[PDB]
Ligand binder design. Structure first.
Ligand SMILES: O=C(N[C@H](CO)c1ccc(F)c(Cl)c1)N1CCc2cnc(NC3CCOCC3)nc2C1
Length: 328
């Protein structure tokens, strides 16, 4: 029992300790008696909502297929032996010490640590994008860190196959104005800016405020930037806004490495067609001390209908996907 909730994971997993909770789940750390290490166990109860069932199936299917040092994996999955009895699914994963959200609230990151965290985010992102997948929800709380500065990207609930919410501070401007892999690069740019000054770069208070924070730093879009906004009302809205001059990156970040600001500028490009791509970002001079393309793997197979399936069919798909972890 954990805080009035049943966590039926044993006998392999013992000594449970509460970590946190979400809308349809609870995370605990536990001791794995087979591997002799503490693990993270997420109890998820999504079967009453369509959206939660989609998030659950996406995370399970994607994470079981992915295998990369900078992406959290799934070690084990616990659920009931019959569909009717299955109310919750327990997802067992590597236990991480902290996340980038917590780290940025408490520590001053050295230029070497910022460089190394950005490198690992992009290294994992290279793999995700080579699988034709968009994470779509990159933010500091989804970047797990261990004692040795190793980083893993987690929470693939909103991930989707490329076809070209607690915070919107990391969402690309085209999401409002209109998506490509370029939406993840924007979120990485926001994270880099946050690592440089320990504060979110575009902390919008409401929906339209998010774009105002973006334009307040980037400046008003150029004529070419505007021409690429196809939607009539969104272009008229952009034209109606007061004029803004670009804030130079070194005024906002006077202590940052000029090479980090050059990369930041390319990731936080208003026009997604002109935004830097993951392989180009890895090869940027800011990351030269870690860049090693022979040690930056790609997915063996591109990843491959859910947004219209009912919750009852998604539960069957979740049951089928988890079957190989059940006893004989
Ligand atoms: O999938 C998640 N988290 C996502 C974040 O949105 C999530 C989803 C549903 C939820 F219901 C909650 Cl609550 C959290 N994981 C699994 C893997 C793991 C491994 N280790 C640590 N360790 C903690 C130690 C304390 O600092 C933070 C990391 N956490 C985690 C969280």
């Amino acid at each position: 029992m954990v805080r009035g909730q049943v966590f039926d994971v044993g006998p392999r997993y013992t000594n449970l300790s509460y970590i946190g909770e979400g809308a349809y789940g609870m995370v605990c750390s536990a001791y794995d008696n087979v591997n002799k290490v503490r693990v993270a166990i997420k109890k998820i109860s999504p079967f009453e909502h369509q959206t939660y069932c989609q998030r659950t199936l996406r995370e399970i299917k994607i994470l079981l297929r992915f295998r990369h040092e900078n992406i959290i994996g799934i070690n084990d999955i616990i659920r009931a032996p019959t569909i009717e009895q299955m109310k919750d699914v327990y997802i067992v994963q590597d236990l991480m010490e902290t996340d980038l959200y917590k780290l940025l609230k408490t520590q001053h990151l050295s230029n070497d640590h910022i460089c190394y965290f950005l490198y690992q985010i992009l290294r994992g992102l290279k793999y995700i994008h080579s699988a034709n997948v968009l994470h779509r929800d990159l933010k500091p709380s989804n970047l797990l860190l261990n004692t040795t500065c190793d980083l893993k990207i987690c929470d693939f609930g909103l991930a989707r196959v490329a076809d070209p919410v607690a915070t919107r501070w990391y969402r690309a401007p085209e999401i409002m104005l209109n998506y490509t892999k370029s939406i993840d690069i924007w979120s990485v740019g926001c994270i880099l800016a946050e690592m440089l000054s320990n504060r979110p770069i575009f902390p919008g208070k409401h929906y339209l405020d998010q774009l105002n924070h973006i334009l307040g730093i980037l400046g008003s879009p150029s004529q070419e930037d505007l021409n690429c906004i196809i939607n009539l009302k969104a272009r008229n809205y952009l034209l109606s806004l007061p004029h803004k001059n670009k804030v130079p990156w070194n005024r906002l970040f006077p202590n940052a490495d000029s090479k980090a600001l050059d990369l930041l500028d390319k990731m936080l490009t208003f026009n997604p067609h002109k935004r830097i791509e993951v392989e180009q970002a890895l090869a940027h001079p800011y990351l030269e001390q870690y860049y090693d393309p022979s040690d930056e793997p790609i997915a063996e197979a591109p990843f491959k209908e859910l947004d219209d399936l009912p919750k009852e069919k998604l539960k069957e798909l979740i049951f089928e996907e988890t079957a190989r972890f059940q006893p004989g």
